[PDB]
C-alpha cells in the first residue's frame, strides 16, 4: 500500500468499457455494476488502462449489503498479464451518477488486492459535467482536527486523460465532429471562450451557495475547502497599479501588429481586384470579335 | 451673450478667481451683480472664491448619465468582438 497519489489519467479505453459493462450485466435501473479497475500504480499520476466487470449483486433496498466474487478476481489477474503484463490491480470503478456513503465498505474489500490505496473512478454513464464526465476520488485515514476522531474519507483527485499513439488515433479514426469543445479556427476558439466565461460564471455560483448551506443547512466547517478559498483572494486582483496599468500599455502593443497584418491583407486583395480586371481586359477584345 | 460664452469659458481657464477679478471678467461694475449672476448661472463662490472643478464635474457627469455609452468609451472587448467577425464574414 503506497499513499503515492497526485492525479488520475484515464485511457479512453476505461471510460467506454465501463459502460457497456454496466448494461450487459444488466445491474441497472439505479442498480449498481461495480468492477475491478486495472492499470499503473505506485506513481503520483495514477494511470489507469483498462477495466473488467464483476458479478456483484446490490440490494437496492439496502446499499450497504452487496455480492462480490472475491475469488473470481485473482482468476481474472492470470488473464490480465496476458493482456499486457504492466496491468496489476489498482481499484474499482463505480457507475455514477456520484460518490456514496455506501463506498467505503465495498472499497474495504478492496484492500486485499491492491498495492495501492483502492481508486474509486467514478464514470458517470450519463455524460454530465463541464469537463471529463468523470470525477476521481481516493479513500484516504486521516484525523479530523476539529475534535472527532479519525475517519476515513474520500479526497478528489483531478481527471485527465493521456494516451497511448495507437489509441489516440483511433480516437480520431473513429470520430468525425470538428469539435467546439477545442481549439481550431477563430469561429472554433469563439465557442470555446464564451462557454469558459460561463463556466466561471456557473462555477462561482456554486461557491455562493455552499457558504450559506453551512450555516443554513446545517453542513459542518470543513477547512479544508476554505483555507484555498482563502488564498483566492489573496491572488486575486486588484486596481490603480503600475502592473494594471503595463496591462494597457501591451493592449496598444498587440493590436497595432494585427491592425499592420489586417493592413498587409488588404494589399494583396487589392491586387487580385487589379488582376481580375487583367482577366476583363482580355475577355473585351474577345467579345468584340465574335 | 458676452457674459454666457466667458462663463463657459472659464471652466477650464482657471480654477480659482478673487470675487473682484470674476467681476473683472464677466463685465460687470458692480460686485454685487456679480454675486447675482453667480445664483443663475450656477457658479459656487464660496468665501468669494470660485470653484470651477466643481461645475466641471457636474456637466462630465450628465453626458456619461445618456446612452451612447458603450461605444463612447469602447470597451476592450467591444474592439475585439468586431475584428472576429469580420475574419470570418
Not at chain 1, 473512478?121 to 476522531?149: F, N
Not at chain 2, 453667480?38 to 457627469?61: H, T
Amino acid at each position: 500500500m503506497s499513499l503515492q497519489h497526485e492525479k488520475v489519467t484515464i485511457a479512453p479505453l476505461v471510460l467506454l468499457s465501463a459502460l457497456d459493462h454496466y448494461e450487459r450485466t444488466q445491474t441497472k435501473e439505479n442498480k449498481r455494476c461495480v468492477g475491478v479497475i486495472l492499470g499503473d500504480a505506485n506513481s503520483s499520476t495514477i494511470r489507469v488502462t483498462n477495466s473488467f466487470a464483476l458479478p456483484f449483486e446490490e440490494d437496492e433496498k439496502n446499499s450497504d449489503v452487496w455480492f462480490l466474487d472475491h475469488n473470481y478476481i485473482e482468476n481474472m489477474n492470470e488473464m490480465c498479464k496476458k493482456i499486457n503484463a504492466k496491468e496489476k490491480l489498482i481499484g474499482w470503478y463505480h457507475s455514477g451518477p456520484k460518490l456514496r456513503a455506501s463506498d467505503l465498505k465495498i472499497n474495504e474489500l478492496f484492500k486485499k488486492y491492491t498495492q495501492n490505496n483502492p481508486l474509486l473512478l467514478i464514470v458517470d454513464v450519463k455524460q454530465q459535467g463541464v469537463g471529463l464526465p468523470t470525477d476521481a476520488y481516493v479513500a484516504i485515514e486521516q484525523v479530523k482536527d476539529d475534535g472527532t476522531s479519525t475517519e476515513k474519507t474520500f479526497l478528489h483527485l483531478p481527471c485527465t486523460i493521456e494516451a497511448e499513439e495507437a489509441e489516440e488515433i483511433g480516437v480520431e479514426h473513429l470520430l468525425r465532429d470538428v469539435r467546439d469543445q477545442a481549439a481550431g479556427g477563430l469561429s472554433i476558439r469563439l465557442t470555446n471562450q464564451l462557454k469558459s466565461l460561463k463556466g466561471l460564471q456557473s462555477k462561482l455560483k456554486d461557491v455562493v451557495e455552499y457558504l450559506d448551506k453551512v450555516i443554513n443547512k446545517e453542513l459542518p466547517i470543513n477547512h479544508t475547502i476554505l483555507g484555498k478559498l482563502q488564498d483566492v483572494f489573496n491572488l486575486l486582483p486588484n486596481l490603480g497599479t503600475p502592473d494594471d496599468d503595463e496591462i494597457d500599455v501591451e493592449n496598444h502593443d498587440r493590436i497595432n501588429i494585427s491592425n499592420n497584418l489586417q493592413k498587409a491583407l488588404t494589399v494583396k486583395t487589392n491586387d487580385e481586384l487589379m488582376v481580375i480586371y487583367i482577366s476583363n481586359l482580355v475577355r473585351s477584345i474577345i467579345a468584340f470579335d465574335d | 451673450a458676452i457674459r454666457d460664452e466667458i462663463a463657459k469659458n472659464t471652466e477650464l481657464s482657471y480654477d480659482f478667481l478673487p470675487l473682484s477679478n470674476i467681476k473683472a471678467l464677466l463685465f460687470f461694475n458692480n460686485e454685487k451683480e456679480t454675486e447675482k449672476f453667480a445664483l443663475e448661472r450656477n457658479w459656487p463662490i464660496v468665501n468669494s472664491k470660485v470653484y470651477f472643478n466643481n461645475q466641471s464635474k457636474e456637466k462630465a457627469d450628465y453626458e456619461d448619465e445618456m446612452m451612447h455609452e458603450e461605444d463612447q468609451k469602447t470597451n476592450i472587448i467591444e474592439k475585439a468582438m468586431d475584428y472576429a467577425i469580420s475574419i470570418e464574414n
